[PDB]
Design a protein around this ligand. Sequence first.
Ligand SMILES: *[C@@H]1O[C@H](CO)[C@@H](O[C@@H]2O[C@H](CO)[C@@H](O)[C@H](O)[C@H]2NC(C)=O)[C@H](O)[C@H]1NC(C)=O
Ligand SMILES: *[C@@H]1O[C@H](CO)[C@@H](O[C@@H]2O[C@H](CO)[C@@H](O)[C@H](O)[C@H]2NC(C)=O)[C@H](O)[C@H]1NC(C)=O
Ligand SMILES: *[C@@H]1O[C@H](CO)[C@@H](O[C@@H]2O[C@H](CO)[C@@H](O)[C@H](O)[C@H]2NC(C)=O)[C@H](O)[C@H]1NC(C)=O
Ligand SMILES: *[C@@H]1O[C@H](CO)[C@@H](O[C@@H]2O[C@H](CO)[C@@H](O)[C@H](O)[C@H]2NC(C)=O)[C@H](O)[C@H]1NC(C)=O
Ligand SMILES: *[C@@H]1O[C@H](CO)[C@@H](O)[C@H](O)[C@H]1NC(C)=O
Ligand SMILES: *[C@@H]1O[C@H](CO)[C@@H](O)[C@H](O)[C@H]1NC(C)=O
Ligand SMILES: *[C@@H]1O[C@H](CO)[C@@H](O)[C@H](O)[C@H]1NC(C)=O
Ligand SMILES: *[C@@H]1O[C@H](CO)[C@@H](O)[C@H](O)[C@H]1NC(C)=O
Ligand SMILES: *[C@@H]1O[C@H](CO)[C@@H](O)[C@H](O)[C@H]1NC(C)=O
Ligand SMILES: *[C@@H]1O[C@H](CO)[C@@H](O)[C@H](O)[C@H]1NC(C)=O
Ligand SMILES: *[C@@H]1O[C@H](CO)[C@@H](O)[C@H](O)[C@H]1NC(C)=O
Ligand SMILES: COc1cc(O)cc(OC)c1O
Ligand SMILES: COc1cc(O)cc(OC)c1O
Ligand SMILES: [Cl-]
Ligand SMILES: [Cl-]
Ligand SMILES: [Cu+2]
Ligand SMILES: [Cu+2]
Ligand SMILES: [Cu+2]
Ligand SMILES: [Cu+2]
Ligand SMILES: [Cu+2]
Ligand SMILES: [Cu+2]
Ligand SMILES: [Cu+2]
Ligand SMILES: [Cu+2]
Lengths: 559, 559
Amino acid sequence: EPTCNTPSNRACWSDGFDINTDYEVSTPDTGVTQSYVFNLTEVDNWMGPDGVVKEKVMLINGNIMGPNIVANWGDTVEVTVINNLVTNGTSIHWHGIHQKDTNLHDGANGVTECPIPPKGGQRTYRWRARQYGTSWYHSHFSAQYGNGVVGTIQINGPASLPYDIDLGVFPITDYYYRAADDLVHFTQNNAPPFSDNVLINGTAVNPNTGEGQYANVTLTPGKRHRLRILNTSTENHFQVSLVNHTMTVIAADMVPVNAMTVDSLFLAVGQRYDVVIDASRAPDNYWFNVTFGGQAACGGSLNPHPAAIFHYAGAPGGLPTDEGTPPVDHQCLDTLDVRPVVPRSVPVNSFVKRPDNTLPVALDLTGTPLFVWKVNGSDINVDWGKPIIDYILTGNTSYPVSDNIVQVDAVDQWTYWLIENDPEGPFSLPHPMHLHGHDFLVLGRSPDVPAASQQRFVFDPAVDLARLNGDNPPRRDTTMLPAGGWLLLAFRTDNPGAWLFHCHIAWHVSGGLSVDFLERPADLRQRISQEDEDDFNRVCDEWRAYWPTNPYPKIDSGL
Amino acid sequence: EPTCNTPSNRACWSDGFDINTDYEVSTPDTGVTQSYVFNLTEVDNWMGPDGVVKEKVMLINGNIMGPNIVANWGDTVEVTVINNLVTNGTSIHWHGIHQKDTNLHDGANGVTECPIPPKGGQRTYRWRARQYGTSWYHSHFSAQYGNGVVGTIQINGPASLPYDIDLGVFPITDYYYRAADDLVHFTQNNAPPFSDNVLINGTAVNPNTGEGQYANVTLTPGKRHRLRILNTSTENHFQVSLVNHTMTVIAADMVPVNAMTVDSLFLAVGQRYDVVIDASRAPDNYWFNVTFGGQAACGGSLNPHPAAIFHYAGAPGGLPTDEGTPPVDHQCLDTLDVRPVVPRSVPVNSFVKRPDNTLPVALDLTGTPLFVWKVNGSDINVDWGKPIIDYILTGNTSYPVSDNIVQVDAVDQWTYWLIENDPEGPFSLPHPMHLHGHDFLVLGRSPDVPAASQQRFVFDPAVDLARLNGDNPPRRDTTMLPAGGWLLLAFRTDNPGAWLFHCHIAWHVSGGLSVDFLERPADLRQRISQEDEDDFNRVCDEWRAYWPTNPYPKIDSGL
Ligand SMILES: *[C@@H]1O[C@H](CO)[C@@H](O[C@@H]2O[C@H](CO)[C@@H](O)[C@H](O)[C@H]2NC(C)=O)[C@H](O)[C@H]1NC(C)=O
Ligand SMILES: *[C@@H]1O[C@H](CO)[C@@H](O[C@@H]2O[C@H](CO)[C@@H](O)[C@H](O)[C@H]2NC(C)=O)[C@H](O)[C@H]1NC(C)=O
Ligand SMILES: *[C@@H]1O[C@H](CO)[C@@H](O[C@@H]2O[C@H](CO)[C@@H](O)[C@H](O)[C@H]2NC(C)=O)[C@H](O)[C@H]1NC(C)=O
Ligand SMILES: *[C@@H]1O[C@H](CO)[C@@H](O[C@@H]2O[C@H](CO)[C@@H](O)[C@H](O)[C@H]2NC(C)=O)[C@H](O)[C@H]1NC(C)=O
Ligand SMILES: *[C@@H]1O[C@H](CO)[C@@H](O)[C@H](O)[C@H]1NC(C)=O
Ligand SMILES: *[C@@H]1O[C@H](CO)[C@@H](O)[C@H](O)[C@H]1NC(C)=O
Ligand SMILES: *[C@@H]1O[C@H](CO)[C@@H](O)[C@H](O)[C@H]1NC(C)=O
Ligand SMILES: *[C@@H]1O[C@H](CO)[C@@H](O)[C@H](O)[C@H]1NC(C)=O
Ligand SMILES: *[C@@H]1O[C@H](CO)[C@@H](O)[C@H](O)[C@H]1NC(C)=O
Ligand SMILES: *[C@@H]1O[C@H](CO)[C@@H](O)[C@H](O)[C@H]1NC(C)=O
Ligand SMILES: *[C@@H]1O[C@H](CO)[C@@H](O)[C@H](O)[C@H]1NC(C)=O
Ligand SMILES: COc1cc(O)cc(OC)c1O
Ligand SMILES: COc1cc(O)cc(OC)c1O
Ligand SMILES: [Cl-]
Ligand SMILES: [Cl-]
Ligand SMILES: [Cu+2]
Ligand SMILES: [Cu+2]
Ligand SMILES: [Cu+2]
Ligand SMILES: [Cu+2]
Ligand SMILES: [Cu+2]
Ligand SMILES: [Cu+2]
Ligand SMILES: [Cu+2]
Ligand SMILES: [Cu+2]
């Protein structure tokens, strides 16, 4: 609960708690729990928001996304997930949510937990709100969030700007007619398709039948407005802009940033950015355009102009008439100009490339299926019925090779990670790289160049040390790995558990694009409570019980 | 020679020849032969126009391009080609030059001749210029033209518009510091690289050092000028545009067309557009920009802004100052609005797909190397030491698979060809499809989408007969095959010959992307002259004899 957060002062929140408070080491005690249930059901022949009937959808409480969770900073959020799907396991991952000492509530099935069984299994997740900002939650069961298992989190708190109205979440998703497993088998041997449409907060028009409707957001004239924009796509990466208006980014993912005003923004998959918009132009209807760039290397759509309408309150109705101007091609690259409100510094001199700090990504085309993704020479392939948490608990330390375990014992230390992008391969792609348990610092990346340019860059200290940023760099949970090049990441081992680090393109992690940071194993066995350990075996026993009866194979990594 | 061709009336040419004559059935008798020699040699460590030193080049008379051939409508062109390369054969193909019953001069090694042996090998081509306009010549000995065995052709004749100055040729080319064979070798297992630079009339600035010079054309203020723009690249497809000026296309490849005024034009490898430009703007310097569109699906260059300077005679020196606006994205597609001055009509109310009219193009990844191109189940591979003409002349009619033979017996009839671009494959790229011996009709294509939009079209009678056009359609020798799509074209069988039909990207034809039209083979043998026969046999003799002493392997189609 806030006591001094007001339109005129958003930086303050409670006594001793504000925009300057280091939220990773200090949280509010509110005593308040927001409770939620997620009841999942498979719908066949469902008539989607643009007119088109889909073969099958996977639906939370029978809507297009689940419940929009809202808690305040300091609260707890508890969610009982009941899986009334026909065949599918599930497991809800809370994206952006650090899980500080609650690794078991992470929802990375095969890693932190077995999936809840179909036809009625259930499980309560509970975690603390030690961050405030905009994130979201979705299935990590192979690519099922692409079927509909997904929604948003708003955990309210201080902002790095005053604003009058919080317009609330504005999520954006690529939207395909073919269901998520059809799409996985399809991308095992074939280039990912253009999305059939892009939904904006649930809705979009069919550029071919005219059915459906635009998102319609009403600005109070002369008021400033927080809008919380997200990319919930399985694959599209997006570029966004508001015709005749600037957007001032006040946070990226769930990390508040100094005010940074811009004409457009790239959001990858899993990215979010909260922004203020000042309704100070002429009363009217303005397009909100979704565009794309980086020469389709990070997706596009058969809808050639996905859009929403921003309508000033008092102005006539109907559609915008200024088409606007195209934004700068952002080239499948996020902006590294953002600067956290709450600093971090680490040194960006000393750097040595060695096998224990380096994650080489490589598309193997010489197997079956054609498109297989490998980190440090192995495609991930978790065991759904034998998560890493059952190894931890039963004391087994011989993790399979499939598991892609990257072991980190150092306690509370900064660790630097070189992620390499198939500099050697036949070709290289944009990958949206995202970390569970943690926000990383984006120390640096290989030169910014058009995405489809085939140029290949190997980290060199002679030239690349000079390019690193150790002084309050971007901190967030999702960033771009450059086409044919390299990302230099750093994270503080401040959270024992098994924490995935993967590309967030549903087809890519599906095909092998993951690691598993085993972060501080022995500490982790101790901080896992009896209620979690016990709930872990129940769900695991039932699943293992469920699994052999299931009429369909596992046909991908599990993630 | 012309007797009435003046700036005010370009349509006339001489007594009985004019812009309306059907140059495919009627030619001037001038009795004039224009003679040329091409003395080809290997130079190692050669400093290119942009200040950068290449490992190896193959040049014609010690320059970056060979003689600029020039002649009147009617004459003969007779070029002795003396091969003073170390290791490689050569065979100079005259591209856009139909070779009316001069098939053994077409310069397709493996098809119409053996390679001219290295170390003083020698052969003289003669063909009649029964077509005026702009085209070009280059090697066909695998990818050798990527090294410098290239140049251009201007057969003077009437035009579709009056103009005061012929600015003469302006060839545009991708420019790669690596040597052709290495590039071949590379693209066998890797996406093709963006060019290191683009040369315009033979020159470019290096955009990393500034060394070199811009191409620089003077305009006589107030005058109408004709520029004969060509795309001579191994790969890049280009978009061009003149800042603050229009261009009127008065010809396409060697087909004049009715005048068509545009803002910018797309040229695929091989293509040519003569245009008219009126220096009617303010006296100044303007950038002529080469840009790319179609989402790098057919091109890119690491020079961000290849440009030349169009300088108005009388205005001052220095660089153009108005940077201008990017042309439209032409999506890797040639324009089909173009109308030949001498029209052809065929029927388009009536088509049926069959094996015998259907070219299925296929990228095959299942083998060695990674990237093999297949048309109708087979990657072409010709035999430099037994050319299909040694078959026609030995009455041997048992052609290997490899040669990708297409027997068209019909005498002087329209034949229809459905070309399919891997609608089933893992992905599909545009291809510049080039027919030897003929100009084709472009009846049509799959409809026009973004080049990387992943869309797959199969020709459909129901839907696609209303998209065809038998009423004077673009006529030309190169046109685009759409990514995942199709193309329908036609030619008359008025030329007994063996005629390659292949994608002009050096890499893809090196890879297998060809067929061979064995056009009216019975007709062919009666028509080879004693001197053509014996000369073909001589060269074949010295090639077959040279070949066992060649130190490198053939690694590619041959072509
Ligand atoms: C989870 O959900 C769907 C249930 O429909 C499964 O997807 C189907 O897989 C079958 C068997 O491989 C295919 O033949 C169907 O085409 C798929 N249909 C759709 C609509 O995707 C998937 O197999 C399931 N995975 C598991 C292990 O339960
Ligand atoms: C914003 O979205 C709008 C509406 O979807 C886009 O407007 C379309 O513009 C195209 C492009 O010329 C027109 O042919 C359509 O008729 C427009 N739709 C409407 C309803 O006006 C708009 O172009 C987007 N603007 C930008 C920069 O992408
Ligand atoms: C054509 O000429 C070039 C002349 O060098 C040959 O190219 C070389 O090929 C060898 C053998 O694979 C390589 O080691 C060299 O690196 C190549 N040099 C360059 C710069 O490309 C090529 O083999 C010749 N081809 C034939 C068929 O004789
Ligand atoms: C056309 O070509 C010029 C040739 O390089 C490009 O213009 C710029 O080059 C100047 C040299 O004057 C540089 O300062 C700029 O960085 C380049 N222009 C920019 C930033 O766009 C030019 O852009 C090309 N323009 C067109 C018409 O698309
Ligand atoms: C899930 O929703 C269904 C409606 O389809 C309802 O019948 C059922 O009781 C719900 N499950 C639970 C335990 O909430
Ligand atoms: C959007 O909603 C507002 C407020 O209720 C209304 O003024 C307007 O009619 C709507 N316009 C659109 C985008 O269709
Ligand atoms: C990559 O695997 C190698 C070789 O097996 C191992 O020595 C190395 O430390 C691994 N690196 C990472 C980053 O896990
Ligand atoms: C070819 O050019 C060379 C120099 O490169 C010259 O020596 C030679 O005489 C010329 N050869 C012929 C046959 O024209
Ligand atoms: C082409 O370059 C040549 C030099 O070989 C020059 O004489 C000519 O005028 C150039 N063409 C144009 C259009 O500038
Ligand atoms: C281009 O040539 C013209 C005509 O000779 C001259 O006026 C102009 O200064 C030249 N410009 C450059 C940059 O070389
Ligand atoms: C394609 O191949 C088949 C042989 O399977 C043949 O029947 C057909 O004539 C071929 N099509 C063309 C145009 O070559
Ligand atoms: C733009 O995205 C892709 C293009 C491709 O060509 C292949 C892929 O996966 C194997 C891709 O993801
Ligand atoms: C843009 O052109 C290509 C892209 C690719 O990714 C592979 C290729 O194989 C030849 C290509 O030609
Ligand atoms: Cl996370
Ligand atoms: Cl030709
Ligand atoms: Cu996520
Ligand atoms: Cu996550
Ligand atoms: Cu990826
Ligand atoms: Cu994840
Ligand atoms: Cu050619
Ligand atoms: Cu040709
Ligand atoms: Cu091709
Ligand atoms: Cu050819």
